[PDB]
Design a protein around this ligand. Structure first.
Ligand SMILES: *[C@H]1CC[C@@](C)(CC)CC1
Ligand SMILES: *[C@H]1CC[C@@](C)(CC)CC1
Ligand SMILES: [Zn+2]
Ligand SMILES: [Zn+2]
Ligand SMILES: [Zn+2]
Ligand SMILES: [Zn+2]
Lengths: 330, 330
């Protein structure tokens, strides 16, 4: 019962209020090292992230789970530096997202399992920092390689107790296939969060997952392009459903009896090179609260709509602790 | 008139016998750092590369051009270590090959030009090592992003005098479109090598490029799967034309008056993670000479077929020096 962070193991009690799907920087493997000026400078990115995490900490956040994989350009040295300076725990991820390079896409399920286990059990690169979560992705029907990634993630989870969290095209109901593959490997749904699930309003899809034991990641609450006029790229990324609409899915699942299975987050970033240039500026204009958006805006909104403080504390503290603490069956 | 290597500038005289298309390791950005055990260990890869380069040096090679880009997982610290230990100059590359990540594929022609110029004029990552060549790629008709890469490579070459070298699907005559795009930006064909050109027997394609001034990269001479029975992956990568057939294209271009435009190489590697597992073992069984294959087997073969020593010295020493030495018009 300890959770690996970029600064070492922490007890479940130390995690506190936890955002379960966030990014310091959404990039690509090697990109921050090769082209730091894309972000102004590495120091500028560090400074921005520390300011943002300090603001989140002032609003009550104690831990974020950075679900950046290898192919999101996860730099655990950057995460450790930012975590130290902001006094916010950061859980790092292994796994693979939607942009694996050839050297990953040509691998077998066994090889991929070895790589994920390396990052969980030994360390990331030469840093000794161990991942506390496994991140995977589909965008519609899984590609053949994505099927291997899902299976390898299940195998790594079954060996270590570390949970799996997923990226979906929620409107395509990807979670159903993801669940099918995970269960074919014997993985407990208690160890899996189906993420980007606030991208859909289909309650039959969401409750079908929750009914069989999955955690539901409502992780992009502030993502919306409403009020951005004539920005095609921002609308394609963020959608045109309001943050209130996304947040009300939290209340819906509470009202259906799934309060213990909800995980809430911002899916925010402090740099973002894997999309159009200046998307970060657009996103910061939409949501200047950044990662503090959940505690500063969503929690009071749900309280106004009748959700209790106790229930929201369970969702933001108890559920992330139960999810992250390593086990085969949570 | 100095050429950048991973150990600093060298004079044109110091380059000597030069292989113009080689790789220490064919991988993906960040992969060697994240999963060195894929290659046994980093130290094992270093040892293998040093042994191979020492064998090449004993056969007469003095310089190789490592045309690994960012997305081939070029590790210039690895190149410098291997170059020091083997006493063989290594020229590093910028540019982009066929596996760019999202953080590259979303960039503009201007942004890409900035990145290529960074690696030529300032340094690669934080190493201060500067690229001496720009590598680009198409596989058939250029994708929209590949058109931007080709244009940015031309712009970087026009600003610095550093040459461009290309990957083609030679049987699809990619060099014709590559030339068209390069020339639309004003780039001199004297600054461009159209590579993998030994993958085709079409002399009308090859002479059409050479006639307008391009250098012709006959750079995969030992690549052949003849005599490998029932290895689909090796045959798809290496082809079923013999090394003698590839080598005779050198003689053909000499006989057509293009001796000053021929560049010859092995396109060898000491590690190879961007293809099927154990491809390196298959390749080493096909060609145990590795990068020494050109001087030990191809040069004597061409001499037996009537090519003079003087002409082969011009192709292996003079042409690479004229190609690499920075200039707008060579
Ligand atoms: C938390 C306490 C339970 C209610 C009131 C009903 C599920 C929701 C808020
Ligand atoms: C090098 C000298 C010229 C010949 C004999 C004819 C082009 C080829 C070998
Ligand atoms: Zn995602
Ligand atoms: Zn995310
Ligand atoms: Zn190539
Ligand atoms: Zn090559």
């Amino acid at each position: 019962d300890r959770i690996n962070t970029v600064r070492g193991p922490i007890t479940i009690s130390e995690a506190g209020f936890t955002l379960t799907h966030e990014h310091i920087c959404g990039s690509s493997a090697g990109f921050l090292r090769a082209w730091p000026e894309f972000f102004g400078s590495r120091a500028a990115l560090v400074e921005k992230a520390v300011r943002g995490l300090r603001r989140a900490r002032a609003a009550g956040v104690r831990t974020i789970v950075d679900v950046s994989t290898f192919d999101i350009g996860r730099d655990v040295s950057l995460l450790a530096e930012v975590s130290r300076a902001a006094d916010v725990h950061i859980v790092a991820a292994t796994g693979l997202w939607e942009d694996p390079p050839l050297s990953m896409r040509l691998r077998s399920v066994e090889e991929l399992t070895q790589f994920f286990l390396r990052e969980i059990q030994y360390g990331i690169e030469d840093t000794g920092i161990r991942a506390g979560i496994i991140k995977v992705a589909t965008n519609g029907k899984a590609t053949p390689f994505q099927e291997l990634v899902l299976r390898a993630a299940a195998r790594a989870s079954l060996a270590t107790g570390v949970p799996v969290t997923t990226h979906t095209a929620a409107s395509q109901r990807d979670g159903e296939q993801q669940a099918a593959i995970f269960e074919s490997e014997g993985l407990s749904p208690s160890r899996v969060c189906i993420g980007h699930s606030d991208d859909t309003d289909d309650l039959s899809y969401l409750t079908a997952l929750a009914a069989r034991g999955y955690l539901i990641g409502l992780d992009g609450i502030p993502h919306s392009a409403i009020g951005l006029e004539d920005n095609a790229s921002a609308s394609a990324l963020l959608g045109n459903r309001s943050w209130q609409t996304r947040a009300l899915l939290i209340k819906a699942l509470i009202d259906q009896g799934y309060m213990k299975q909800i995980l809430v987050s911002n899916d925010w970033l402090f740099g973002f090179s894997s999309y159009v240039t200046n998307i970060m500026d657009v996103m910061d204009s939409v949501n200047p609260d950044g990662m503090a958006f959940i505690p500063l805006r969503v929690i009071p909104f749900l309280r106004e709509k009748g959700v209790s403080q106790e229930t929201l504390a369970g969702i933001t503290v108890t559920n992330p602790a139960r999810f992250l603490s390593p086990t085969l069956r949570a």
